[PDB]
């Protein structure tokens with residue numbers, strides 16, 4: 293349905309109040325049920341009005357005007373609901389035409405560190421709420437871990453580049469507002485072995501289905517058997533994977549043993565049986581000789597010796613009958629061996645390709661992920677097909693930047709917060725002699741976790757952060773993932789496939805250039821560097837890594853089919869001081885709860901909060917994503933406005 297659809301699109305149950313709404317509307321939860329149903333219709337219809345046309349601000353007046361009777365009659369309640377939705381960024385978020393121009397007198401000074409999606413989303417909220425917002429951004433550009441390369445006809449994203457399902461996804465709103473050109477991804481993904489030979493379909497399917505099996509098995513180990521701590525250490529996904537593969541190999545070796553025992557037993561029965569038939573031939577040779585030696589006792593001696601001879605001959609023909617049913621059991625046993633090994637060398641390499649795919653998805657080696665919690669956010673996936681931003685994901689943050697007071701090339705070095713306000717200190721990256729001091733009432737820190745982890749610190753906090761926050765920083769994972777962009781003047785690959793795989797030759801290097809993407813109008817290929825390879829490869833010059841790309845591609849399509857690229861780009865997210873990695877992951881020994889601790893504001897001791905946190909690493913249910921970063925900016929904007937303008 294329509295207004296039910298709007299609730300779903302807002303990640304809300306269409307037919308009950310959230311706890312958050314119960315808090316803000318206690319008169320509703322404690323009042324009659326009829327009024328609670330009225331409340332929910334107001335909420336859903338208001339969201340529909342916004343979502344049907346997110347390019348313009350949805351005001352209270354226009355909501356009241358578009359409500360049908362009797363709902364447009366409870367004016368006070370309509371306003372209460374509108375105000376709540378707006379404050380929490382469920383309407384009038386993103387970029388839209390303001391009907392009410394911005395208030396000319398501001399209220400409170402907020403410094404936002406970082407002009408990524410989380411910083412931009414919060415800034416637009418706080419500016420709409422009437423506050424004085426200034427963003428300090430170290431790079432010469434907005435977008436942070438959204439980073440679009442453009443040169444000639446080439447456009448390619450070096451950071452984020454995929455919108456997961458639009459159903460429930462706030463990026464669906466931003467897409468409509470900004471005009472992102474999105475394009476659904478075709479799912480076919482052929483694999484090529486390291487010699488460039490295609491992986492046959494049967495081997496592709498066999499290994500993939502086994503991959504699914506192994507992983508489901510780790511999840512049974514974890515969440516049914518509670519195999520989560522071992523020898524006083526938290527178990528990693530990689531560790532569990534090594535364990536379940538070891539058990540499959542044990543099982544294979546056992547069925548092999550059982551089968552060899554069956555072989556041996558059959559051979560032994562034949563040896564014995566042949567010895568017995570041997571002696572029975574010898575016994576018949578003796579009776580057959582006493583049959584030619586042959587009176588009344590002679591006429592009866594032949595009858596008796598024929599009775600004896602042909603009785604031994606029946607013993608012998610019946611034993612050659614067993615001889616046949618046995619060497620017939622033997623022949624098919626030698627012809628039906630169970631698998632010699634669990635994974636052929638090629639089978640193992642292909643399986644390592646699927647592992648690399650998972651290390652791509654989590655941006656970190658599997659041996660680092662928490663076995664128990666690495667996919668704790670699975671239950672929050674959006675519905676619908678995934679898409680890529682054909683026109684470059686920077687269109688989103690660039691659009692969000694319009695009208696904001698953003699100081700680029702401005703690197704924060706120190707953040708001071710007291711019960712009397714805050715001071716942020718920064719340097720000009722083009723002239724690190726030039727220094728700036730920003731006084732403010734509140735700081736919103738959207739520095740990446742990688743920057744927060746940096747030792748010695750890039751940014752110094754005064755007073756230092758509390759142990760519960762720094763130890764959460766210490767526990768959490770911050771991964772890495774890199775891309776090689778190859779721009780050609782001609783298309784030599786299969787244009788109808790968005791993906792194809794290169795099966796690495798070894799486990800340790802399974803993530804090197806393992807997956808190629810074909811996603812754009814023009815001839816562009818992205819090659820991914822995942823897992824252990826991701827950090828190590830940053831130490832390779834551009835030209836050499838491109839050469840390795842080209843060698844792979846020449847192996848797949850032929851040496852003369854692959855021309856020299858006209859333009860190349862190589863991400864190095866770990867070495868980037870403004871990222872120091874790509875995005876968080878749930879490290880073994882961490883959990884979603886660390887994401888909640890990351891979101892928690894700091895209050896200087898006896899008082900009111902001064903230092904706030906946003907970014908993909910602060911949102912438990914949507915970490916490591918653009919929409920999660922976005923939502924986190926909206927969340928903190930609500931928290932800060934509640935503090936400085938009143939709930």
Ligand SMILES: [C]C1=C([C])[C]=C2C(=[C]1)N([C][C]([O])[C]([O])[C]([O])[C]OP([O])(=O)OP([O])(=O)O[C][C]1O[C](N3[C]=NC4=C3N=[C]N=C4[N])[C]([O])[C]1[O])C1=NC(=O)[N]C(=O)C1=N2[C]([C][C]=O)C1=C(O[C]C2=C(F)N=[C][C]=[C]2)C(F)=[C]C(F)=[C]1
Nearest residue numbers: 406408410430436437452453454704907908916917918921
């Ligand atoms: C890196 C990366 C990559 C490479 C990729 C990707 C990513 C990443 N992702 C993630 C995102 O992006 C995130 O989450 C966001 O971005 C966040 O944001 P924030 O929070 O805001 O942060 P930033 O941005 O960084 O910001 C901050 C700021 O700050 C600053 N600074 C620093 N330092 C300093 C400063 N300032 C001042 N001072 C100082 N000192 C900086 O600069 C900044 O600005 C993503 N996401 C999403 O959503 N999507 C996508 O797509 C993405 N990605 C990926 C990964 C994984 O896997 C993904 C995917 O994949 C896709 C693909 C690719 F990429 N390629 C090819 C093919 C495919 C998927 F599918 C999904 C997902 F989910 C993800």
